[PDB]
Amino acid sequence: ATSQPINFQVQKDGSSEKSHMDDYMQHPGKVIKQNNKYYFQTVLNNASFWKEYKFYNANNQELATTVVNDNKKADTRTINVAVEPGYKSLTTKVHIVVPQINYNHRYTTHLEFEKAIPTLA
Numbered sequence: 001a002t003s004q005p006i007n008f009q010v011q012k013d014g015s016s017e018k019s020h021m022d023d024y025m026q027h028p029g030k031v032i033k034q035n036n037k038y039y040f041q042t043v044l045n046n047a048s049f050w051k052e053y054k055f056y057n058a059n060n061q062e063l064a065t066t067v068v069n070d071n072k073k074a075d076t077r078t079i080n081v082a083v084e085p086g087y088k089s090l091t092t093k094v095h096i097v098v099p100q101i102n103y104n105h106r107y108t109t110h111l112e113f114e115k116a117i118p119t120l121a
């Protein structure tokens with residue numbers, strides 16, 4: 001397995017404006033290559049707020065996500081999202097629950113890699 005950091009920004013549905021969702025993922029993320037497979041590895045902040053998250057490519061095919069680590073004390077979670085070299089944009093669909101502000105909403109956003117996912121090595 002080899003990796004490189006990658007810059008990205010989550011943007012609002014139907015807009016190029018930065019999404020609130022961008023604030024809850026750590027920057028930069030990471031691209032990982034292992035055994036002919038690529039992953040975008042990213043850390044969700046305040047993971048307990050994220051009741052559901054699903055990721056899709058530009059062809060609206062759901063991308064497999066796995067938990068790398070779930071850190072309850074820090075309230076973070078590292079996940080891998082299956083990707084391929086050349087991916088530029090992911091659609092995400094999330095259900096966010098913040099009980100202390102009576103907040104319970106579902107959203108779609110698009111995550112924009114700064115550059116296409118590169119071919120590593």
Ligand code: HEM
Binds near residue numbers: 011024046101
């Ligand atoms: C306690 C923390 C939070 C506050 C105060 C908050 C506040 C808001 C507000 C006020 C809006 C409506 C649009 C606006 O007025 O700007 C909004 C929408 C939205 N929020 Fe939350 N939010 C919180 C947590 C989160 C989390 C944890 C996520 C996802 C990880 C999230 C994702 C979104 C998304 C995707 C929208 C739709 C517009 C956009 O894409 O930015 N929010 N939020």
